[PDB]
XYZ file of C-alpha atoms in Angstrom:
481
model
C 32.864 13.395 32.219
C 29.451 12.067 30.148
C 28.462 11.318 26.752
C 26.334 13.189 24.537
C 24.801 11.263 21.401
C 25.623 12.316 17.512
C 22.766 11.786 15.574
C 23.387 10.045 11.978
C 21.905 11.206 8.751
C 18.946 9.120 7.549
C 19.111 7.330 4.351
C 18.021 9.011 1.537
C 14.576 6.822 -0.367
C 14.138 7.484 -3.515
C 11.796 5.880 -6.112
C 13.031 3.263 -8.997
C 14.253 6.497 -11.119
C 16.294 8.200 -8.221
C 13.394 11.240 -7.711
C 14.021 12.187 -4.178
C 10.609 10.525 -1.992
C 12.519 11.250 1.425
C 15.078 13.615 2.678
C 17.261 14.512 5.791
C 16.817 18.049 6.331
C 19.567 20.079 8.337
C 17.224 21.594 11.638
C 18.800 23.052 15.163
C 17.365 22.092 18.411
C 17.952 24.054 21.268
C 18.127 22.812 25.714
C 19.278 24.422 28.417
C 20.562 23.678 32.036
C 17.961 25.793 34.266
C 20.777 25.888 36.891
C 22.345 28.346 34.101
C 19.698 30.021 32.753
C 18.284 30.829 36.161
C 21.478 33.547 36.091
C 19.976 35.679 33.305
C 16.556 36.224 34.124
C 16.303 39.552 32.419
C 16.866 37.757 29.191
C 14.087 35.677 29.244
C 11.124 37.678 27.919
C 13.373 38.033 24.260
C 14.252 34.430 25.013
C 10.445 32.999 25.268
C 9.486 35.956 21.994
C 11.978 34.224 20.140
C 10.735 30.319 20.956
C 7.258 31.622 19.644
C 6.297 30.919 23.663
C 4.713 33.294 25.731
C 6.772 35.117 28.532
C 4.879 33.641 32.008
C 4.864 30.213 30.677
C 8.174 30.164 29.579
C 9.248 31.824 33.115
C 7.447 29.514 34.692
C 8.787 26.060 32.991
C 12.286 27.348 33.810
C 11.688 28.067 37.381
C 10.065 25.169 38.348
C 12.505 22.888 36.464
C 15.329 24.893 38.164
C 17.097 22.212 40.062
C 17.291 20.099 36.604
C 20.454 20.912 34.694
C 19.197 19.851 31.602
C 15.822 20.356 29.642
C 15.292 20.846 25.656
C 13.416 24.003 24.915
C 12.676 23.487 21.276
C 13.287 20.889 18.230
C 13.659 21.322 14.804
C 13.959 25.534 14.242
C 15.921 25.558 10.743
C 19.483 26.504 11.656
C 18.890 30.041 9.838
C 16.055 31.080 12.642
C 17.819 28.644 15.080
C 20.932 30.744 15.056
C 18.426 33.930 15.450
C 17.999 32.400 19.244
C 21.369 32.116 19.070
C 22.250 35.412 18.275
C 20.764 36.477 21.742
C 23.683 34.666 22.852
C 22.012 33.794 26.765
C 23.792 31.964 28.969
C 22.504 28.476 30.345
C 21.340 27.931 26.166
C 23.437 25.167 24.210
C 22.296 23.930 20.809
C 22.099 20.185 19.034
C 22.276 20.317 15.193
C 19.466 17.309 14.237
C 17.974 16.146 10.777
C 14.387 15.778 10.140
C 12.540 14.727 7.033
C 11.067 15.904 4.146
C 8.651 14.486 1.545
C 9.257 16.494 -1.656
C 6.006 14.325 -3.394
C 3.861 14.778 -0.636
C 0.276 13.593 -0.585
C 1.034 11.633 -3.896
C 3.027 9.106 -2.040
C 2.312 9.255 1.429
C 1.150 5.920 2.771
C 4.159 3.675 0.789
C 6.921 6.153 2.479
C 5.289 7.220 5.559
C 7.205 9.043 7.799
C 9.475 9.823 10.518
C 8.385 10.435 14.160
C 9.834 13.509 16.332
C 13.076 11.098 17.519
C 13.775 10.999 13.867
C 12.274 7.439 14.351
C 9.836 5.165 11.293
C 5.831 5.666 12.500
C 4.690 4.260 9.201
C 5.328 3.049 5.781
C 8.543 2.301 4.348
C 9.941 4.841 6.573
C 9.191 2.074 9.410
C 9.390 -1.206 7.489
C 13.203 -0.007 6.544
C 14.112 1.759 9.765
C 17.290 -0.251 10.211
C 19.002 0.154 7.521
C 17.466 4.119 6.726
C 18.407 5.170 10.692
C 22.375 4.137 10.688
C 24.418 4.547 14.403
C 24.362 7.267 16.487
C 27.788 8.687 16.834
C 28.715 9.270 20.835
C 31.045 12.537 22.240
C 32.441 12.844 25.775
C 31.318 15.906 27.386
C 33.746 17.029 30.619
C 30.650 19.882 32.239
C 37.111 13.838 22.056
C 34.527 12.562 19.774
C 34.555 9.160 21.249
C 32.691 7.470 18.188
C 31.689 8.638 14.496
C 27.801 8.439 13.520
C 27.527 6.141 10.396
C 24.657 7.071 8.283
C 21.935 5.277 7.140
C 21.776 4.073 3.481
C 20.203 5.234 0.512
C 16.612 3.199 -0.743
C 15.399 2.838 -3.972
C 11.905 2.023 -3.823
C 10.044 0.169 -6.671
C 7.209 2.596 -7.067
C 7.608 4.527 -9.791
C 6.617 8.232 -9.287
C 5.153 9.400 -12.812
C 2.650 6.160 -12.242
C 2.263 7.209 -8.619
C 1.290 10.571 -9.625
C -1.152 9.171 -12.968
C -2.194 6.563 -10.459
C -3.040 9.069 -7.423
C -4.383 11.504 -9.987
C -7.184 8.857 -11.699
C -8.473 7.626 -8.390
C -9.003 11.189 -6.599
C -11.533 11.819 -9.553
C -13.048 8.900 -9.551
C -13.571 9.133 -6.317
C -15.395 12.711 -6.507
C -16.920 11.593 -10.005
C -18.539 8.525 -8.015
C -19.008 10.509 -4.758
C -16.822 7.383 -2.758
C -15.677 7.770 0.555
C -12.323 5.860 0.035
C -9.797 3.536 -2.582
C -7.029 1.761 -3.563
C -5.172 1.123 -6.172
C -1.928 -1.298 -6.903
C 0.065 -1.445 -9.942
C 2.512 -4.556 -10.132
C 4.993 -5.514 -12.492
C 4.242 -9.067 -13.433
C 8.169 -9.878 -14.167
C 9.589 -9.013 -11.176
C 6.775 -8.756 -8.587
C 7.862 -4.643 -8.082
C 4.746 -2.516 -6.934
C 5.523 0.517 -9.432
C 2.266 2.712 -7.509
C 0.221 2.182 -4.459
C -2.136 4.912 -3.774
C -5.323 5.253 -1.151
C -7.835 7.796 -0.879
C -7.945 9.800 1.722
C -4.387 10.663 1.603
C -2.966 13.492 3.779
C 0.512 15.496 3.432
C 3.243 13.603 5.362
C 5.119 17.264 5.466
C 2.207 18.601 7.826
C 0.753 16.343 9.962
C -1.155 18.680 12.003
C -4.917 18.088 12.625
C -4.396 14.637 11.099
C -7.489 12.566 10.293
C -6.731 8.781 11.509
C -8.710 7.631 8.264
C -6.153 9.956 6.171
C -2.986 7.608 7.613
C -4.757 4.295 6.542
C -2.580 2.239 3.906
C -6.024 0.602 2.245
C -4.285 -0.935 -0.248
C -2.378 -3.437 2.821
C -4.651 -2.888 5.670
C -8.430 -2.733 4.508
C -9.540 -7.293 3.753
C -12.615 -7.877 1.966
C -14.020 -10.850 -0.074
C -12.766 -10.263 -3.770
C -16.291 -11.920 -5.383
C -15.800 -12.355 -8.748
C -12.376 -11.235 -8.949
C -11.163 -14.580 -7.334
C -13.400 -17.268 -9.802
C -10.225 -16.870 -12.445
C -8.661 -18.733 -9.861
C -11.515 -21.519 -9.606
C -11.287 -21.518 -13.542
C -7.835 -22.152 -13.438
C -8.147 -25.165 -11.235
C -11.441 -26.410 -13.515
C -8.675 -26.068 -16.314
C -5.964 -27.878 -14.879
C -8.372 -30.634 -13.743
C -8.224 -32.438 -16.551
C -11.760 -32.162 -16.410
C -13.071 -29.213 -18.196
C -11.693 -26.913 -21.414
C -13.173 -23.759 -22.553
C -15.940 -24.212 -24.816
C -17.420 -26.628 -22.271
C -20.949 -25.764 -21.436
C -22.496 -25.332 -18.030
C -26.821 -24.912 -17.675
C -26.984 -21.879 -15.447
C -30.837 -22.108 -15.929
C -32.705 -20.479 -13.971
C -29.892 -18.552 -12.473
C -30.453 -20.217 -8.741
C -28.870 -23.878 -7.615
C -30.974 -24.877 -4.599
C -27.676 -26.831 -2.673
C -30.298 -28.196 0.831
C -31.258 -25.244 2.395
C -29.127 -22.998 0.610
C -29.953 -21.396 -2.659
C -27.065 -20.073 -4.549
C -28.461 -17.016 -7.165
C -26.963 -15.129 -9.914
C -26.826 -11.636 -10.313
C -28.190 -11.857 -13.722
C -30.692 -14.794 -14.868
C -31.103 -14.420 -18.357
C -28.945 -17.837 -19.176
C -28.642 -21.600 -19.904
C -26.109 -22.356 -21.485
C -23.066 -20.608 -21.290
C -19.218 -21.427 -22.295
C -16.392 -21.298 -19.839
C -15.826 -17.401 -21.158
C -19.604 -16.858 -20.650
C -19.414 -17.839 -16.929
C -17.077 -15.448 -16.775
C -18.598 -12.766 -18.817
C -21.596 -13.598 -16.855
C -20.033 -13.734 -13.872
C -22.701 -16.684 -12.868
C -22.271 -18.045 -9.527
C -24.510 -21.090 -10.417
C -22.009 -21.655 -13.391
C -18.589 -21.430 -11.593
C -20.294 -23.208 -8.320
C -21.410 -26.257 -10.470
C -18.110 -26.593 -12.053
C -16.272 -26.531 -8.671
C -18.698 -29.496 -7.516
C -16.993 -31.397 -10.354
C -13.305 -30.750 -9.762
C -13.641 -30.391 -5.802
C -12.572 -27.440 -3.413
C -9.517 -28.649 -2.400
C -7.959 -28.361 -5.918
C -9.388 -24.126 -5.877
C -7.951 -23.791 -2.476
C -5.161 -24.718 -3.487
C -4.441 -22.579 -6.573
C -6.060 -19.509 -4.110
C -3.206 -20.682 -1.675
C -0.220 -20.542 -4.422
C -1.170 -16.878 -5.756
C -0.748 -15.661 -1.919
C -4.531 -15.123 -1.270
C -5.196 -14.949 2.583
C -1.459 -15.925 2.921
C 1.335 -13.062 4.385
C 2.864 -10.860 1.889
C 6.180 -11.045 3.708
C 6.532 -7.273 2.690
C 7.074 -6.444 6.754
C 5.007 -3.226 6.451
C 3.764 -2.327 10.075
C -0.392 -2.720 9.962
C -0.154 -5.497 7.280
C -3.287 -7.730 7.158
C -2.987 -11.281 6.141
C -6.850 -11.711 5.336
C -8.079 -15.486 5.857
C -7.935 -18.390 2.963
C -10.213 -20.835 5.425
C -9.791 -24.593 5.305
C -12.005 -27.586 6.038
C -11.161 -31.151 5.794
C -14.640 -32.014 4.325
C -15.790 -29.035 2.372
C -19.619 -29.378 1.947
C -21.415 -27.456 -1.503
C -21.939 -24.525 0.025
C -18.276 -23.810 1.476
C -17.237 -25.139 -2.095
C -19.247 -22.951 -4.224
C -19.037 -20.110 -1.866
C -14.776 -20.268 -2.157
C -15.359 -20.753 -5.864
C -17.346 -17.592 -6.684
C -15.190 -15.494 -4.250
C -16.993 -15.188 -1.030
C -15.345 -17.857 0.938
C -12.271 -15.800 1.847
C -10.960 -11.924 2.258
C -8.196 -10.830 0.943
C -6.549 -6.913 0.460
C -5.847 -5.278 -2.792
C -2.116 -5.880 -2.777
C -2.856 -9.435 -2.240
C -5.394 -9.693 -5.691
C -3.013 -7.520 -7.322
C -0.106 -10.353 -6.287
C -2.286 -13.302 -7.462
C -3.153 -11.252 -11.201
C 0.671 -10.920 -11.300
C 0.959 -14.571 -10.838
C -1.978 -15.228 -14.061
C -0.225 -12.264 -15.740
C 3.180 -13.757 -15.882
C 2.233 -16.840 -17.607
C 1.692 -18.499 -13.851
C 4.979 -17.661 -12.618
C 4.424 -15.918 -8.771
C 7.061 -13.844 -8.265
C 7.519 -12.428 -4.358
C 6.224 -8.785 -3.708
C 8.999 -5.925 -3.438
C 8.637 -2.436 -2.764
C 11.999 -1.883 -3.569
C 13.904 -1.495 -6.531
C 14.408 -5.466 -7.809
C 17.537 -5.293 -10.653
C 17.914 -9.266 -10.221
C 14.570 -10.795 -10.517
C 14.274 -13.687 -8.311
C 13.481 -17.353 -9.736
C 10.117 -17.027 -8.063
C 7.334 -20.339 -8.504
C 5.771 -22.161 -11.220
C 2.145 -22.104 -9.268
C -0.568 -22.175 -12.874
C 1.166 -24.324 -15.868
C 1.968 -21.931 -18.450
C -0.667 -23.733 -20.923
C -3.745 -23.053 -18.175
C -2.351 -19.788 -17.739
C -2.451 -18.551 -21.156
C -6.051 -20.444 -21.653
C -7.341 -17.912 -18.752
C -5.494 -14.850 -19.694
C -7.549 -15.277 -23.113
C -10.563 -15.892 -21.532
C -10.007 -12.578 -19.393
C -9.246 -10.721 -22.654
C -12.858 -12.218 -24.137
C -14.674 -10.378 -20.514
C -12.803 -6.751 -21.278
C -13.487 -7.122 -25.087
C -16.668 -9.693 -26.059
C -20.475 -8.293 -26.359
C -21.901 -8.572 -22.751
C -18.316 -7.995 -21.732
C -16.787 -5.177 -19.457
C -16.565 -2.433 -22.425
C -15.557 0.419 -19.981
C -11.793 -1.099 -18.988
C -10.829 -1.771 -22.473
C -7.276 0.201 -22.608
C -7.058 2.295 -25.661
C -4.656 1.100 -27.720
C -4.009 -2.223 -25.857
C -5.777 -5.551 -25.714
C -6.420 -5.828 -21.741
C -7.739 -8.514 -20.163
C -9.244 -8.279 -16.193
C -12.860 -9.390 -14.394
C -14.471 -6.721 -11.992
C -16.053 -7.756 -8.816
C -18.542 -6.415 -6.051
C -16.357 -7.066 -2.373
C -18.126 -6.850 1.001
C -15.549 -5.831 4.040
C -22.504 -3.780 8.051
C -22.292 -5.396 5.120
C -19.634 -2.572 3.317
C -19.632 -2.923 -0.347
C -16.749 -2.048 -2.593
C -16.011 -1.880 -6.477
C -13.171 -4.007 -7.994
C -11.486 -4.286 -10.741
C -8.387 -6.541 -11.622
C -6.690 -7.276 -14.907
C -3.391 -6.671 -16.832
C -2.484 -5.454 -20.750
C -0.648 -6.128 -22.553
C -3.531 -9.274 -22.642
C -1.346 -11.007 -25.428
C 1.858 -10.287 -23.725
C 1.183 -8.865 -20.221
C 3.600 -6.358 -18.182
C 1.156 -4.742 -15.734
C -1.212 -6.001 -13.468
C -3.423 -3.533 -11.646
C -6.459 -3.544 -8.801
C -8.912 -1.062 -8.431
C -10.977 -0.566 -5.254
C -13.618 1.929 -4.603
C -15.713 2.027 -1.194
C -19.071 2.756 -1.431
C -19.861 4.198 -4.705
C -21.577 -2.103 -9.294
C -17.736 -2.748 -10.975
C -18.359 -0.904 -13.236
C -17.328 1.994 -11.157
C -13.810 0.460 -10.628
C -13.449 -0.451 -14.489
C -12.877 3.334 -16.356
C -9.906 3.896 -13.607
C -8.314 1.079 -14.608
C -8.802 1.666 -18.410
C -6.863 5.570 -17.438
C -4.630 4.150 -15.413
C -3.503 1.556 -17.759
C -3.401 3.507 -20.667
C -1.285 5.948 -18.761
C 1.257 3.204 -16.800
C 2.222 1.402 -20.343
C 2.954 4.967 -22.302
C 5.056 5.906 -19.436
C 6.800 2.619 -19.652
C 7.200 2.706 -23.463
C 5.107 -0.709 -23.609
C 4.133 -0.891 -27.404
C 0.664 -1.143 -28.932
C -0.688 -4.239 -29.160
């Protein structure tokens, strides 16, 4: 007497809507005991034809594993074909009736499911991350050579992502991509509400269905894996501290003249140096490193740390996802100018795109973080009051004034929406990317969204979003504003 495992049906994922994303197909996988087999040898030439392996080979695996009593042959034949081998009928051949998966989106959505690995087993994405409760229990059988326990099957997921803006969102970045002749991207859409990522896409993707001559760079979830320092995208953050400061409101002026700050030995420089004065909006609009680094002398570091620390940057995303970096948020006890100033404009940390995109929620949502979920969130958690409402709204305005002002970021204004956002140029020998971050409704925002684009500056990353966003609020029935 011995046991023979019953494998269990894998959970069904779906996205938020219930479209299939994951799916246990019925397959047949044949062994054999040799010992057996060895008893029909004039079989085994229309045997080996019918296992697509060739008749010496197949001869000789047999022979040699002879003394063995058990050996698979082949996994995963559909049952149709599988019964084909079956209709041979050959003695020594006995047959296991297995699942395996299929991806019915694809390419589209490949790195947030992942998928399965020959065992039936999470190798990446979701597919991993939710392994327990996708895989349910092997049943177990007695075998004499009574079903002694029933397989329980893994449950049903409902991701967050939403696959009409997975397939907008997947669609916008491949040609941007090609239109900007860019080796690689990401790009996160977030609902600021309930912290739900509604599409996460990367270029290169690949088709989780056939994994054959796979390119590692294909399987790489950018969007979690790839840190970089977010530049600009980050000195919302340092505004928000100046605001809450009690030290600074927005039609302040800050001398950015001559677009350098000599701090000792180090000279801090501007991108552009065609300003003096310049309002709280225009250091944005400016992006002016002198500007935001001068301000952040006058409130201190420790006060932008800590807002960068509240809005997750450099801190874990506790979404459990295998590769998952964490980035790095550094911390000093003294923080000298150029530390400061070097946090302040954005280069003082690194951070990955889901991160940003968590933090822009955070501003988005009138300074309410909310904790990340690629699942399917129906009761929204309490989540943290980390920007006051008041400072929120103040830089959410501000924001607005960069998409929309003269001088401003023309190219990510949304079509029919007031958006708000700040682009950014990243560095991961020095590898430069294109950001863009922002949300819309500006007045009333629902969506927050990053755009990253290796090696095309932000401009590049700004007419995605502007698509994307357009796209992402029609499909949700967000009205004009």
């Amino acid at each position: 007497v011995r046991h023979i495992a019953i494998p269990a049906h894998r959970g069904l994922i779906t996205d938020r809507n219930g479209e299939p994303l994951a799916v246990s197909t019925p397959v047949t996988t044949l062994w054999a005991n040799p010992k057996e087999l060895m008893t029909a040898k004039e079989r085994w030439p229309q045997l080996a034809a019918a296992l697509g392996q060739d008749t010496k080979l197949f001869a000789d695996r047999i022979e040699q594993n002879a003394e063995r009593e058990f050996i698979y042959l082949v996994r995963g034949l559909t049952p149709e074909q599988g019964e084909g081998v079956i209709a041979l009928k050959v003695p020594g051949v006995y047959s296991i009736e297995e699942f395996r998966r299929f991806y019915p989106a694809g390419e589209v959505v490949a790195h947030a499911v992942g998928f399965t690995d020959v065992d039936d087993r999470g190798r990446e994405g979701i597919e991993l991350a939710f392994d327990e409760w996708l895989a349910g229990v092997p049943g177990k059988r007695q075998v004499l050579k009574q079903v002694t326990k029933n397989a329980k099957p893994g449950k049903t997921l409902a991701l967050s992502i939403d696959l009409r803006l997975q397939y907008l969102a997947h669609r916008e970045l491949r040609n941007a991509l090609l239109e900007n002749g860019a080796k690689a991207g990401s790009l996160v859409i977030m609902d600021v509400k309930t912290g739900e990522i509604l599409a996460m896409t990367n270029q290169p993707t690949y088709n989780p269905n056939n994994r054959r001559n796979l390119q590692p760079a294909a399987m790489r979830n950018r969007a979690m894996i790839d840190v970089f320092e977010p530049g600009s995208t980050v000195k919302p953050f340092s505004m928000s501290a100046a605001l809450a400061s009690g030290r600074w409101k927005p039609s302040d002026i800050v001398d950015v003249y001559p677009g350098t700050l000599q701090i000792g030995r180090y000279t801090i420089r501007d991108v552009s140096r065609n300003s003096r004065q310049l309002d709280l909006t225009g250091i944005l609009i400016k992006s002016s490193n002198v500007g935001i680094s001068k301000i952040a002398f006058d409130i201190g570091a420790e006060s932008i740390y800590s807002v960068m620390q509240q809005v997750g940057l450099g801190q874990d995303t506790g979404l459990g996802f295998p590769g998952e970096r964490v980035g790095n948020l550094p911390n000093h006890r003294k923080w000298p100018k150029a530390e400061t100033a070097t946090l302040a404009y954005g280069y003082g940390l690194s951070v990955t795109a889901i991160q940003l995109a968590h933090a822009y929620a955070a501003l988005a949502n009138d300074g309410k973080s909310v904790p990340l979920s690629m699942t399917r969130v129906d009761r929204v958690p309490d989540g943290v009051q980390v920007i006051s409402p008041e400072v929120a709204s103040t830089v959410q305005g501000m924001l607005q004034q960069v998409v929309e002002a003269q001088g401003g970021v023309f190219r990510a204004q949304v079509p029919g929406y007031h958006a708000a956002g700040k682009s950014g140029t990243a560095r991961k020998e020095n590898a430069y990317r294109s950001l863009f971050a922002g949300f819309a409704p500006a007045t009333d925002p629902r969506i927050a969204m990053v755009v990253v684009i290796d090696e095309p500056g932000g401009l590049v990353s700004a007419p995605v979003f502007s698509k994307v966003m357009a796209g992402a609020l029609r499909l949700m029935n967000v009205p004009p504003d």
